[PDB]
């Protein structure tokens, strides 16, 4: 829905959110190429509670496996990390103090 | 004319020499292209894709680039 | 017309890639 | 002096490498902080070699130059110049460093033109006098009609915070900076605004507290919240007094008399606390430490006891509650007590702080800065300190000028108009003074990525025929009116940028010999 | 290298090769008016660009299919 | 002095290829200034020998032979005038001997 | 008026005294 240079950065913001399911699928011994691809197919249909099932070794329901994460954990992980990376591209000059 | 003692970057020196020995015009562009194929393979490496599976995917992709480049070609010398 | 040309011949285009490559090594360490 | 050198380990140079090392060392200082000038300039990260390096990112030009430690002798004059600019007005330390370096860069262009350096000093003194009249005649005063003065104060804080890390927080941090000085209602002491930095949360979660925050929580068995209390603070010793008689011992004959003395010592410590509660108070703040024997007396009477807040902590509590220090308790009718509504304890970042909610005569504030990292909190504290110091002097001097490159083109126009009414000996030095004043909107325009060769040319054509309020619009990248956009700066800030850079460039240009002595412990 | 933006220039040329049949559409420094490479006479050999894609692919395959480095330390 | 003015175009953010293309048009216009102002000398050889002494008088003015233009100009013009052909620049053998002033030198 | 001012801020005003003082030591050695 955006245009200009803003549309190329939200896609870079959205592609960086797929790293944590790629991290969870790679550490579980699953194939991370087909796991994150299947996760985008389940959430496009309407499955908002779909994720990586480390017990079955695939994609299943999360609330059936009783995996509950608080909202303040995930909101502050997105708010503090975005505020940090908004400063590193602004703070860039190496000055070695004597 | 560099003093690069790095065995991966030494292969980029022999790549520019091999373009000079065969054709001799695109010695600069063959290093930027080889660095571009390896830069795009860095993000694919973090997704768990096998490096030979990327190399097998580049051969099926470069085969399309050879056949498509032979569409419009004519000279009357 | 090209409507201008902004020549940027300065340092911090290379240091900006150094902060990116250093933070990628930390994320891959605890991956 | 180089020929037949009569020095041990010292070296010198006269008129060949003296002005060469002075112009190299001063331009490299100005070219260092050149990238930090303007609303789109980047920031620096300062690091050491090791041994508790303590990295401190700063965008202000004074904090960069005070930590680098330049070995050049002439570069230390520009470092000390930006130190006075931070201590006097608190802003323009980066603008005075680039302006003093662009004067010496134009003076380096007068090396090959064979201009005498005393002619450049006499040419710049007449150029600085013409530039003082440009800012004085264009200053906008504000007396009555206070609804336009509070709107003018938000343009001062909006201009200062635009060149810092608080870029997309001007809807919040402008209100945190204007209302902090507006709650002072008097002199700009610049210490009643206690800034508390706590990790966790974004910069949008920061706020200005309506009361006051403190540490060193309330006792052991004392109440944590008292509604409608009378706050009495103190600066006296509670226990282990050893009262002011050096050389006094307890020389008794038996150990039964020692038990009578130590009971008499605790009775006088109990009688001192009994003189405090005759005022009818519920809270007690002592600058010194409170030991266990008076702490039990305040807990039995239902009185709070805040022990060892700070040396300057009782000063802010005296300005936010409306009381006095009251270090002696012998006249309850001559001791004024504080006033509050709630002394409940709040938790900010897993740390319990004493919140003095609902205080009367609150001429003190508490800014609760919350950031993602410690590097952001150290930058946002210096960014707020560069904004509160200008508003503390804008309420003392209400004269404001139009910033954003508009003030520099007004100063450069008055020099160029008087450069044509002068003979050719000093007219070339005055034209170099006007070109350095036009470099200050050129650094701002080129830091965003705009066409700096055309925007300053459009500013020079605008100010040549009218348009006294025309400046640089960094939002869209064009030329707009500064009175409409609301980009104004203080008169005393822009005067100290012009005056201190003209005096510092006068010193370095008059140097023809740099005789450095032999250093100690350097081999 | 010509002073333009890489996104604002590559998106416009690539979109024009899909709406019509794909012409000799590139870029230039002074831009020579239009972006048609057939009118600007920017002519390169077929076997030159054929060996640019063929040699860079095989050199990438020999530096992707390697998982060990056995270099020594100091010289002596 | 061209690269000193090119150092002034560093802070103006001018592209360096624009300075190269700007100087190629500037050098092409500068060739037409020297070509249209060149003074030829064909016949009337009494004005060409006077013109040759102005060439040697300008070259020797920027050297150590400052106050010797009444002698060293005739030693340089008549040396090439006695060649009467190609400028081989080896038939003029210069012999350097100590003793005497520079006015004592001769052809 | 002063009819001009020629500022000469360069090296060889001091090296010219070095050639004078060196030649005075030679003339005083064989004096
Ligand atoms: N007039 C022009 N307009 C647009 N592009 C051009 C023009 N002239 C040359 N180029 C581009 O510049 C590039 C130069 O490549 P080059 O460095 O010569 O390759 P190699 O190093 O193999 O000789 C070519 O790929 C070509 O596409
Ligand atoms: N909104 C704006 N529009 C135009 N110019 C601005 C704006 N905000 C800030 N500036 C300019 O940015 C400059 C920042 O200078 P600064 O680095 O704060 O100086 P100092 O270090 O002395 O405080 C100011 O001179 C001001 O003219
Ligand atoms: Mg400022
Ligand atoms: Mg000559």
**Sign of the Cα pseudo-torsion (A31, A37, A42, A47, in order):** positive
Q: Is residue D397 within 8 Å of D491, Cβ to Cβ?
A: yes
Residue matched to tokens 């002199």:
D187
| Contacts with A97 from chain D: Cβ below 8 Å | 46-48, 67-69
Which of D182, D157, D195 is closest to D316 using CA atoms?
A: D195
D234 strand-pairing partners: D286
Which of D150, D198, D187, D141 is closest to D363 using CA atoms?
A: D187
Cα F17 from Cα E49, distance rounded (Å): 26
| Contacts with G14 from chain D: Cβ below 8 Å | 2-3, 14
Residue matched to tokens 């008689």:
D245
Residue matched to tokens 């503090």:
A80
**Distance from the Cα of residue F78 to its chain's centroid:** 17
Question: Under an 8 Å CB criterion, which residues of E touch B?
Answer: 24, 44-57, 59-65, 67, 69, 71
Other C-beta atoms closer than 10 Å to the C-beta of E19 total 6
Q: Which of D35, D42, D451 sits opposite C4 (nearest CB)?
A: D451
Residue A73 tokens, joined = 């954990």
The DSSP call for residue D306 is: E
Residue G25 tokens, joined = 């030591």
Measured between alpha carbons, how far is residue B15 from residues A11, A37, B19, D405, E57 in Å?
35, 36, 6, 53, 11
Which of D415, D407, D425 is closest to D129 using CA atoms?
A: D415
* DSSP of A7-66: HHHHHHHHHTTTHHHHHHHHHTTS-HHHHHHHHHHHHHHT-TTEEEETTTTEEEETTTTT
Residue C23 tokens, joined = 């933070």
- With touching defined as 3 or more inter-chain CB pairs under 8 Å, the answer for chains D and C is yes
Q: Is residue D442 within 8 Å of D404, Cβ to Cβ?
A: no
User: Which of D18, D425, D426 should one mutate to test binding to chain G, selecting the residue with the greatest count of G CBs within 10 A?
Assistant: D425
Q: Is residue B37 within 8 Å of E56, Cβ to Cβ?
A: yes
Residue F59 tokens, joined = 């070259």
Q: Is residue D341 within 8 Å of D362, Cβ to Cβ?
A: no
Q: Which residues contact D181 (CB under 8 A, 6 or more apart)?
A: D153, D188, D193, D388, D391, D392, D395
Cα A34 from Cα D6, distance rounded (Å): 81
Question: Under an 8 Å CB criterion, which residues of C touch E?
Answer: 1-2, 4-7
Reported as type and span, the H/E element at residue D366 is strand D365-371
Residue A60 tokens, joined = 């299943």
Q: Which residues contact C18 (CB under 8 A, 6 or more apart)?
A: none
Q: Which long-range contacts (CB under 8 A, 24 or more apart) does A17-26 make?
A: A19/B46, A21/A51, A21/A52, A22/B46, A22/B47, A22/B48, A23/C31, A24/A52, A24/A54, A25/A52, A25/B48, A26/B48
The DSSP call for residue D401 is: E
Other C-beta atoms closer than 10 Å to the C-beta of D48 total 14
Query: What technique was this entry resolved by?
Result: cryo-EM
Residue E53 tokens, joined = 């894609």
Other C-beta atoms closer than 10 Å to the C-beta of D149 total 15
Residue D310 tokens, joined = 């700070």
- Between strands D306-307 and D283-286, the pairing is parallel
Measured between alpha carbons, how far is residue G16 from residues B39, D116, D193 in Å?
63, 22, 65
Longest Cα–Cα distance in chain F: 61
Residue A26 tokens, joined = 């790679």
Mutate to test the pocket of ligand 2, among D95, D405, D456, D497 (most ligand atoms within 8 A of CB): D95
Which of D200, D136, D47 is closest to D499 using CA atoms?
A: D136
Q: Is residue D214 within 8 Å of D361, Cβ to Cβ?
A: no
Residue D332 tokens, joined = 């309850």
Whether D95 has a binding-site annotation, put simply, is yes
The values of phi and psi at residue D45, to 5°, are -120, 120
HEC readout, D102-118: HHHHHHHHCCCCCCCHH
Q: Which residues contact D410 (CB under 8 A, 6 or more apart)?
A: D134, D135, D138, D401, D463, D468
Q: Which long-range contacts (CB under 8 A, 24 or more apart) does D319-322 make?
A: D319/D192, D319/D363, D319/D364, D320/D192, D320/D211, D320/D212, D320/D356, D320/D359, D320/D361, D320/D362, D320/D363, D320/D364, D321/D231, D321/D233, D321/D356, D321/D359, D321/D360, D321/D361, D321/D362, D322/D360, D322/D361
| C-alpha radius of gyration, chain F, whole number | 22
Reported as type and span, the H/E element at residue E15 is helix E6-19
Shortest-distance ligand to the CA of residue E30: 1
> What is the crossing angle of helices B51-69 and B29-46, to 10°?
140
Residue B64 Ramachandran class (φ > 0 left, ψ -120 to 50 alpha, else beta): alpha
Whether F62 has a binding-site annotation, put simply, is yes
Q: Which long-range contacts (CB under 8 A, 24 or more apart) does D472-479 make?
A: D472/D404, D472/D405, D472/D406, D472/D441, D472/D444, D472/D445, D473/D404, D474/D38, D474/D39, D474/D40, D474/D404, D474/D444, D474/D445, D474/D448, D477/D448, D477/D450, D479/D455
D337-365 exposure pattern, b = at least 16 Cβ within 10 A, e = fewer: bbbbebbeeeebeeeebbbbbebeebbbb
- Decide: helix, strand or coil at residue B58: helix
Question: Are the Cβ atoms of C6 and D42 closer than 8 angstroms?
Answer: no
Reported as type and span, the H/E element at residue D45 is strand D43-47
Question: Under an 8 Å CB criterion, which residues of C touch A?
Answer: 11-12, 15-16, 19, 23, 31
D111 reaches G (C-beta below 8 A): yes
Other C-beta atoms closer than 10 Å to the C-beta of A88 total 17
* DSSP of chain G: ---------SSTTTHHHHHHHHHHHHHHH--
Q: What is the resolution of this structure in A?
A: 3.2
Which of D346, D44, D376 is closest to D199 using CA atoms?
A: D376
Within 13 Å and on the Cβ side, how many CA atoms surround C14? 4
Q: Is residue D33 within 8 Å of D94, Cβ to Cβ?
A: yes
Which residue stretches of D284-423 are H helix?
Answer: 292-300, 313-321, 374-394, 406-419
**Sign of the Cα pseudo-torsion (D429, D434, D437, D438, in order):** negative
Residue D96 tokens, joined = 């005075």
How far is the alpha carbon of D449 from chain C, nearest alpha carbon, in Å? 7
Cα B25 from Cα F65, distance rounded (Å): 55
- Determine the Cα angle at D212 with ends A80 and D328, to 5°: 145
Tell which atom from ligand 1 comes closest to the C-alpha of B28.
21
Whether D188 has a binding-site annotation, put simply, is no
A8-36 exposure pattern, b = at least 16 Cβ within 10 A, e = fewer: eeeeeeeeeeeeebbbbbbeeebebbebb
Which of D397, D369, D415 is closest to D494 using CA atoms?
A: D397
G20 reaches D (C-beta below 8 A): no
D515 strand-pairing partners: D12
How far is the alpha carbon of D176 from chain G, nearest alpha carbon, in Å? 55
């Amino acid at each position: 829905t955006l245009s200009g240079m803003e549309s190329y950065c939200v896609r870079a913001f959205a592609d960086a959110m797929e790293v944590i399911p790629s991290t969870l699928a790679e550490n579980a011994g699953l194939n991370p190429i087909s796991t994150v691809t299947e996760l985008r197919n389940r959430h496009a249909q309407g499955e908002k509670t779909a994720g990586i099932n480390v017990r079955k070794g695939g994609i299943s329901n999360i609330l059936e496996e009783l995996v509950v994460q608080p909202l303040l954990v995930s909101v502050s992980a997105l708010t503090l990390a975005t505020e940090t990376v908004r400063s590193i591209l602004k703070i860039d000059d190496v000055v070695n103090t004597r | 004319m560099m003093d690069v003692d790095h065995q991966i970057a030494k292969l980029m020196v022999e790549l520019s020499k091999s373009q000079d020995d065969e054709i001799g015009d695109g010695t600069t562009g063959v290093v930027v292209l080889a660095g571009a194929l390896l830069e795009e393979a860095e993000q694919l490496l973090d997704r768990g894709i096998h490096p030979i599976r990327i190399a097998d995917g580049y051969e099926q992709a470069a085969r399309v680039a050879i056949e498509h480049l032979d569409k419009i070609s004519d000279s009357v010398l | 017309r090209g409507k201008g040309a902004y020549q940027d011949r300065d340092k911090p285009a290379q240091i900006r890639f150094s902060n990116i490559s250093a933070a990628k090594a930390v994320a891959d360490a605890i991956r | 002096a180089p020929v037949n050198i009569f020095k041990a380990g010292a070296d010198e140079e006269r008129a060949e490498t003296a002005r060469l090392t002075s112009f190299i060392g001063a331009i490299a200082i100005g070219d260092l902080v050149k990238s930090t000038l303007g609303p789109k300039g980047m920031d620096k990260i300062l690091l050491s070699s090791g041994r508790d390096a303590s990295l401190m990112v700063t965008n202000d030009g004074a904090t960069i130059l005070k930590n680098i430690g330049v070995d050049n002798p002439a570069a230390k004059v520009l470092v000390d110049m930006s130190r006075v600019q931070d201590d006097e007005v608190g802003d323009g330390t980066t603008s005075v460093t680039v302006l003093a370096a662009e004067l010496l860069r134009e003076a380096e262009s007068l090396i090959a033109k064979k201009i005498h350096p005393q002619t450049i000093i006499a040419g710049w003194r007449e150029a600085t006098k013409a530039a003082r009249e440009a800012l004085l005649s264009s200053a906008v005063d504000h007396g009555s009609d206070e609804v336009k003065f509070r709107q003018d104060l938000m343009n001062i804080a909006g201009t200062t915070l635009s060149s810092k890390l608080l870029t997309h927080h001007k809807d919040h941090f402008t209100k945190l900076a204007v209302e902090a000085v507006l709650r002072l209602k008097g002199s700009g002491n610049l210490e009643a605004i206690h800034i508390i930095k706590k990790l966790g949360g974004s910069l949008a979660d920061s706020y200005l507290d309506e009361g006051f925050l403190l540490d060193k929580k309330i006792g052991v068995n004392q109440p944590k919240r008292i509604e409608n209390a009378k706050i009495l603070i103190a600066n006296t010793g509670m226990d282990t007094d050893k009262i002011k008689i050096f050389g006094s011992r307890v020389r008794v004959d038996s150990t039964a008399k020692v038990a009578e003395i130590e009971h008499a010592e605790k009775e006088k410590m109990k009688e001192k606390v009994e003189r405090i509660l005759k005022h009818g108070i519920n809270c007690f703040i002592n600058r010194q430490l409170i030991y266990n024997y008076p702490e039990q007396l305040f807990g039995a009477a239902g009185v709070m006891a805040i022990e060892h807040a700070d040396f300057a902590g009782v000063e802010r509590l005296a300005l936010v509650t409306g009381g006095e220090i009251a270090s002696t308790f012998d006249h309850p009718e001559l001791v004024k007590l504080g006033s509050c509504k709630l002394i409940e304890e709040v938790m900010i970042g897993e740390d319990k702080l004493i919140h003095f909610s609902g205080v009367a005569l609150g001429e003190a504030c508490t800014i609760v800065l919350r950031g993602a990292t410690q590097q952001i909190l150290d930058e946002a504290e210096r960014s707020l300190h560069d904004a509160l110091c200008v508003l503390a002097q804008t309420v003392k001097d209400s004269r404001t000028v139009y910033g954003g490159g508009c003030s520099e083109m007004l100063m450069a126009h008055a020099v160029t108009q008087l450069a044509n009414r002068t003979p050719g000996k000093e007219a070339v030095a005055m034209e170099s003074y006007a070109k350095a004043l036009r470099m200050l909107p050129t650094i701002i325009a080129d830091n965003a990525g705009y066409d700096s060769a055309d925007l300053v040319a459009q500013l020079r054509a605008a100010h040549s025929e009218g348009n006294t309020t025309a400046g640089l619009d960094m939002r869209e990248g064009t030329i707009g009116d500064m009175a409409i956009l609301g980009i104004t700066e203080s008169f005393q800030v822009k005067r100290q940028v012009l005056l201190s850079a003209a005096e510092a460039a006068e010193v370095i240009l008059r140097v023809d010999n740099i005789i450095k002595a032999a250093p100690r412990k350097r081999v | 290298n010509s002073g333009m933006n890489p996104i604002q220039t590559m998106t416009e040329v690539r979109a024009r090769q899909v709406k019509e049949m794909n012409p000799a559409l590139g870029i230039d420094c002074l831009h020579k008016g239009t972006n048609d490479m057939k009118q600007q006479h920017v002519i390169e050999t077929l076997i030159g660009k054929k060996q640019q894609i063929s040699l860079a692919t095989q050199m990438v395959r020999m530096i992707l299919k390697i998982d060990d480095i056995r270099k020594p330390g100091e010289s002596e």
